[PDB]
């Protein structure tokens with residue numbers, strides 16, 4: 001396959017030590033996925049470590065990577081500090097029938113940070129810092145000339161700049177798309193999938209806000225707020241916390257009849273899900289019990305008022321209505337910040 005450089009799945013065989021164009025010294029394989037591979041390599045010209053997204057030698061993967069490159073260059077064309085919360089595309093080029101996207105090498109993802117803790121979560125102050133940076137990034141994406149939906153926000157796609165610092169950068173704009181050029185349903189990761197996407201509705205930049213809500217809850221608690229194994233299971237675990245969705249939008253839900261009957265839920269058979277709205281965030285966060293696991297009792301920034309502000313912000317971010325769901329700017333003005 002491809003003179004011995006590619007293989008099955010159209011993936012470039014990564015040989016640790018190979019040099020590219022007398023510039024890039026391929027160190028190792030740091031990641032794999034549909035798109036192809038990511039390699040850690042050394043830019044000898046700029047003398048710095050970079051990540052290289054090597055896209056598969058299939059046509060559609062190339063076209064998707066080209067959409068991503070155009071979105072990233074469009075983000076590079078807007079001069080504001082907010083853009084510094086997005087991973088920076090350093091270069092793109094074609095090498096041996098593979099589109100390669102050079103990126104800054106960052107530290108570990110937020111799921112790795114959750115795993116460093118014994119999935120006990122991180123402090124609400126670190127959650128506050130992460131949330132501020134994420135809302136600023138989503139504000140940058142909300143710029144009308146951009147109007148970009150990330151379409152796959154998850155802890156694995158939020159990386160740390162330095163492992164000692166609290167700065168973060170969101171990565172993986174492969175599934176991303178502009179507000180106009182939406183090209184696919186089944187867009188987001190299940191745990192962080194917005195309701196409108198589950199209901200087959202025209203989605204927009206609010207699905208990222210939903211994902212961010214679930215992500216912040218998971219960051220503080222250490223566990224996914226909505227750990228659904230399938231679509232209907234995810235929707236049911238959502239309703240467990242947020243009740244039945246506003247019919248005003250279910251009267252417009254193509255996939256409404258997949259979860260609800262005209263408006264109430266569907267029988268299981270089977271242990272029933274917790275009645276709608278009974279699983280309050282209040283108890284998940286532990287607003288009056290010292291936080292998740294009673295470990296944050298008496299800690300600064302972890303008072304009952306701080307937990308209540310966090311609960312309000314999360315609920316504002318988990319709004320069923322995409323039009324009333326909090327926008328990044330007003331999310332930044334929340335009392336939690």
Ligand SMILES: COc1cc(/C=C/C(=O)CC(=O)/C=C/c2ccc(O)c(OC)c2)ccc1O
Nearest residue numbers: 030051087103104105106107108171172173174
């Ligand atoms: C500190 O320890 C580690 C850090 C890393 C860093 C990851 C990246 O730097 C990757 C990166 O920037 C790539 C960003 C990116 C940007 C856009 C994409 O579409 C995409 O697709 C997966 C990836 C990796 C392994 C480690 O052990």
